[model samples]
Target chain A: CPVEFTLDVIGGKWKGILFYHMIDGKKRFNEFRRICPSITQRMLTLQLRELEADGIVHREVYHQVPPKVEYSLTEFGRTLEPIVLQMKEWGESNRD
Target chain B: CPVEFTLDVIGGKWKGILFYHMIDGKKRFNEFRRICPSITQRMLTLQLRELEADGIVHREVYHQVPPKVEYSLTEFGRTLEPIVLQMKEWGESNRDV
Candidate 1:
């Protein structure tokens, strides 16, 4: 019931961080780095691409002089917001 | 909000399986393997030890011939039962199993 379930989807450090940042709204690549400063660019980019491929994040690319890539939460991604928020509270409570 | 949070604890494959199995009652080491048939003995032992260290499961070793190591849900561990049950429902709905 556990291994063959949801943990496989939302069970990693970078994936959880990416989802948490998306709670606000759509964000650019650099914006994500600004919020999560510790993560390397390589790791961040990789996780974002993984999330996009998994249908958790909507990766919108605006074609222009420079390719403008934007990320926002999908419907399923939005469903995780409340869970993450509550988990945040739980984490905070246990912080001490 | 995420990395410095609960994901570190309740966010793994084996740990979740351990919690789900404990929903019935106390179990021994061998019993855990019987339910979670795929996990290796080493992997299961490591996970249970980690869970015990994290204050989730109560590992009670009784003095006997071979020794009786019984694992039960601690108060905190029991809190995860409802969550695991809901997760099971979600998984079953998604699985067509």
Candidate 2:
């Protein structure tokens, strides 16, 4: 249940959406919010921080006026994308 | 996350083992305990009842001595075996790899 338990780490809507979007490439905080319109800024920031702390997402910050920040999947995070895709397929097919 | 959430239903030690053993066929309560030695009678009964309530396991009562009972996976329970097997494979292979 390695991957199954891993889902517990990123199971809820905001976390799942965060991972799903970042799997293909990187996104800034505001860009992520655009993809998942319902997520509050506070919740997005919180989940991204947790994902980075867990070594699942990489956070890059650039020194500038507002500070440019980009989040991307680490190697570990890439490994999870397939599992998440499979779970998503199951969810789509088995809604009751 | 159908199967993933389904794991939340049967995710723990005993439920996983219970499903693993029963995937092949049916077994009675005592037989289930034998396969999962760590499980207590109370916990096993409770988990089995929960599985039954969720329509994941079929419980059959025999009209005979000692009140015989056999439990097996229903259509829905059998549906979960492949997902569990995949999860087990992932667990075994990727141990800090």
Candidate 3:
């Protein structure tokens, strides 16, 4: 279980991608859209909200004319850097 | 990305659980059922087959009075041990938080 709990947060397709991008620094909504162009806006919003609710991702909102927001990893979320990177490495080496 | 490739293999709910259990040693079909009682037999079979297809799990069938089967991780699958362990650790630490 506890591992399942961890999987519950980052088990899906987009969550890991979003988390991977955030490992470098904060990303705006459009930045994520640009990075993952194949992901639909609806799916992006849903996954971002789930990550936020799961406490792995922190969403920052700015009061501005266009309503700006940024997404970054929480302290707890940063702990997953190794796991995510490991997945990336394994996938790269084993890809066919 | 290749990371997505990794997640594609172990992304689901049951796959991770099955992989975690196998980290210790081999497991039989019934053994998996016993370890994960809530998982439907159909799901168990499906996940096992997928793992086998992905080359992450090796399935051996023995013909005897009763057909016996054993499942174990492959060398490639073993590479995921650290990732799986880290997930367990994170989940344990942040369960209540």
Candidate 4:
């Protein structure tokens, strides 16, 4: 059920990838598309919003000359690092 | 990418649950429905078929008057234990954390 719980938060096709990309540091809205060119803008928006709603990711709005929005993992979200890394390792080692 | 690979195989709403329920031993087609009442026959069929296609699950059909089918994990499928258990433990340890 916990798998279900975690999946509910990071289960979708894109959430894990989005989380992976954001693991290092803050990422802008368009950054995801650049890294994963296959993703659509609408999907990226929907997934990020869901991650935001889950309380795992924080959406920061910076008011500047060219205002920008950025995303980073929250402390609670950091809890997923182990599992995410496990997935990454598994994928890398066994990507047949 | 491995997570994506793993998730592609066991990701989605029902695959992990199906895999979790089938972790211990072979399971009947209907047993999944009994354990997880929220699942639909169509969805179970689809997910199970995918798992089978992915080579993680084996589906057995026994010939009999009232024939029955069983589902079990393949040897290769067992490779998912660490990651699956991690999710299980992570979920248990941090349901609220």
Which candidate gets the maximum lDDT versus the true structure? 3
- Overlapping backbone residue pairs in candidate 3 total 0
Kindly report which residue stretches of model 1 are placed more than 4 angstroms away from their true locations once superposed: B80-83
Query: Which pairs clash (backbone N, Cα, C closer than 3 Å) in model 2?
Result: none
On residues A27-85, what C-alpha lDDT tens digit does candidate 4 reach at each position? 99888888877889989899888889999899998989788899999998888888787
Off by over 4 Å in 4: none
Compute the interface RMSD for each candidate structure.
2.7, 5.5, 1.3, 1.6
Question: What TM-score would every model get versus the actual structure?
Answer: 0.84, 0.59, 0.93, 0.94
Q: Write one digit per residue (lDDT tens) for candidate 3, span B1-97.
A: 5667888898878889899999989999888888768899999999999999998999988888688889999998888788898889878877764
On residues B1-97, what C-alpha lDDT tens digit does candidate 2 reach at each position? Answer: 2434544555545566677778879989889766646679999899899888877899999998878889999997776666556555655565653
- Residue B60 Cα positional deviation in candidate 1, in Å, after optimal superposition: 1.1
Clash counts per candidate, in order, are: 0, 0, 0, 1
Question: Considering only chain A, what is the TM-score of each predicted structure?
Answer: 0.87, 0.83, 0.93, 0.94
TM-score of chain A taken by itself, candidate 4 = 0.94
Residue B77 error for model 4, in Å? 1.3
What overall lDDT goes with each candidate model?
0.73, 0.70, 0.87, 0.84
lDDT of 2 at A3: 37
Winner by TM-score between candidate 3 and candidate 1: 3
TM-score of chain B of each: 0.88, 0.82, 0.91, 0.92
Model 2: lDDT to the true structure = 0.70
